[PDB]
Design an enzyme around this catalytic site. Structure first.
Site, short mmCIF file in Angstrom:
data_model
loop_
_atom_site.label_atom_id
_atom_site.label_comp_id
_atom_site.label_asym_id
_atom_site.label_seq_id
_atom_site.Cartn_x
_atom_site.Cartn_y
_atom_site.Cartn_z
N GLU B 62 0.82 -1.20 0.00
CA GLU B 62 0.00 0.00 0.00
C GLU B 62 0.86 1.26 0.00
OE1 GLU B 62 -2.75 1.97 2.43
OE2 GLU B 62 -1.72 1.47 4.31
N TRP B 84 -8.88 -1.22 0.24
CA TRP B 84 -9.30 0.09 -0.21
C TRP B 84 -10.25 -0.05 -1.39
CZ3 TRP B 84 -8.54 5.39 0.72
CH2 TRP B 84 -7.74 5.70 1.83
N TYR B 110 -4.55 10.08 0.21
CA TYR B 110 -3.10 10.04 0.45
C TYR B 110 -2.21 10.27 -0.75
CZ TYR B 110 -4.58 8.40 4.96
OH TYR B 110 -5.22 8.31 6.17
N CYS B 170 -6.67 9.58 7.90
CA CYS B 170 -6.46 9.25 9.29
C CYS B 170 -5.02 9.65 9.62
CB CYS B 170 -6.65 7.75 9.53
SG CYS B 170 -8.36 7.28 9.83
N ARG B 190 -5.13 11.19 13.65
CA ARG B 190 -6.36 11.68 14.27
C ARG B 190 -7.22 10.62 15.00
NH1 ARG B 190 -10.53 10.16 11.80
NH2 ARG B 190 -10.80 9.92 9.53
N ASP B 193 -8.03 2.76 15.32
CA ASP B 193 -8.57 1.50 15.81
C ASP B 193 -7.37 0.72 16.34
OD1 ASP B 193 -10.01 -1.47 14.18
OD2 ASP B 193 -9.62 -1.03 16.29
#
Ligand SMILES: N[C@@H](CCC(=O)N[C@@H](CS)C(=O)NCC(=O)O)C(=O)O
Lengths: 281, 281
Positions: B62, B84, B110, B170, B190, B193
């Site tokens: 990724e 994604w 991103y 994120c 921010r 999980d």
């Protein structure tokens, strides 16, 4: 109830013990640690550091300046705070290549990014109504409508606008959190001088957090202060040790006077710092 | 010398001790905390969590996908990874008003922010050459010509594009630091999980550091992981109690076997992880 300011000194105590030499832009040396964090309760207290005096009038008049969306230094200077003036000065501008700008034009600094993130910046007098994202108002609105939100973020880091600014932003982005009617705010400072600036910053965002809380009916929760390059000037190591032995006095209290309902409505005469008794020097 | 993973676990515990109840955008309820920061040494070891294996094929594939600037979910799909693509299916796109978008067009996410911050967006398959600010290269250039810079920052959080995205970033921003010929990196996350994400991006950014270090000739320092809303999903609470007992096994080690110049040249085969003996799946 361990004093909050103890977290602060702890960071200095730590930079001394564990930090290393790293020279800044002008070649001047510093002792520093990369990546730090501190939490400050905003509950009934107000983290206006007591182990040394903090230019609170500067904190307040400047924040109010940021909210107006102003980027003209003179507009700040006017109210008595003279800290930006040195960047909006004639010579300083002509030197960065901004010979075409009028004295005072700092560029798209905090104010602009705050209320107009994204708008094509023109002069320090262009009307920007409805142009660019108004992050401040948007953070507020989100807090009311969707307090659980994990994206209440305000960000001044505009890669695009960088080369146009008088100098980069220090408080790059801040995040707002709401739980149990309490409003928290973490701030990411890329670089902070533990000695002079940081105390001011801790104050600014604490103030700011009290404000939005007031406007939205929440109790100020905590203030997380996160740093990147936390440093101290080597030429200050002594002045600082004499300070770490200092005992913190109980944090004053911030009391908002009239009931303000809109963030642009806040005026200086609405805040009163009470019980601020700091160690002279 | 305390083991690395103690950090991440110690955070799982604290989020359990104090994690106050708070719901998400689906009311799934979680134990949340706001404002955390872990430190992970990148010296001779690589922080690939062992008390629960981490999808490395993803972490690596990724990040490579990011570096490419690819905002196509199939692009990361073709490489044998699907995390994604859900966000790029079809009902989802239309589910956000995005109908005109192709299947798998993720928006200004991103990759696009890393290589083209500020460039007017169009679609997953269009050419943005000489467009935006190529933060990623700009960071490295700077790491090489000025390791002291207290502003080496890459920001994926763009208030203007935030609407045209599937999910807002994120990974708001990250900052690079250099000292004693060591490259360190702090990431501001921010929301996170703890039991299905946090581990994945810890490594994901650790990997990123190791890469930039290899092309700048600096040696990996520490990865600072700063969190905003750090949470544990309500269900995840039980499995985490048993994963919380698994005693940490030695961090593996990432070896960049091949040797490259530019960053747009790394490839899945250029890496190796050894000493990675995960706890029972
Ligand atoms: N601009 C310097 C860092 C300067 C710095 O951190 N200054 C402190 C004051 S000593 C500051 O900017 N404070 C801003 C504030 O408190 O709002 C650099 O990154 O090289």
């Amino acid at each position: 109830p361990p004093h909050g300011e103890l977290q602060y000194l702890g960071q200095i105590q730590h930079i001394l013990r564990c930090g290393v030499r790293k020279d800044d832009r002008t070649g001047t040396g510093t002792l520093s640690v990369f990546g730090m964090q501190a939490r400050y309760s905003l509950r009934d207290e107000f983290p206006l550091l007591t182990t040394k005096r903090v230019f609170w009038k500067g904190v307040l008049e400047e924040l109010l300046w940021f909210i107006k969306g102003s980027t003209n230094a003179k507009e700040l200077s006017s109210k008595g705070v003279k800290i930006w003036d040195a960047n909006g000065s004639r010579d300083f501008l002509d030197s960065l290549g901004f010979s075409t700008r009028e004295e005072g034009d700092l560029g798209p600094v905090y104010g602009f990014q705050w209320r107009h993130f994204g708008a094509e910046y023109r002069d320090m007098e262009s009307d920007y109504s409805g142009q660019g994202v108004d992050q401040l108002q948007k953070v507020i609105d989100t807090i009311k409508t969707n307090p659980d939100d994990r994206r209440i973020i305000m960000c001044a880091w505009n890669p695009r606008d960088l080369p146009l600014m008088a100098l980069p932003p220090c408080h790059a982005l801040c995040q707002f959190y709401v739980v149990n009617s309490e409003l928290s705010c973490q701030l990411y400072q890329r670089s902070g001088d533990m000695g002079l600036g940081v105390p001011f910053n801790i104050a600014s965002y604490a103030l700011l957090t009290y404000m939005i809380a007031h406007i939205t009916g929440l109790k100020p929760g905590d203030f997380i202060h996160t740093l990147g390059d936390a440093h101290i000037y080597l030429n200050h190591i002594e002045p600082l040790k004499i300070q770490l032995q200092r005992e913190p006095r109980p944090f004053p209290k911030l009391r908002i006077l009239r009931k303000v309902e809109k963030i642009d409505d806040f005026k200086a005469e609405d805040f009163q710092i009470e019980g601020y008794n700091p160690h002279p020097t």
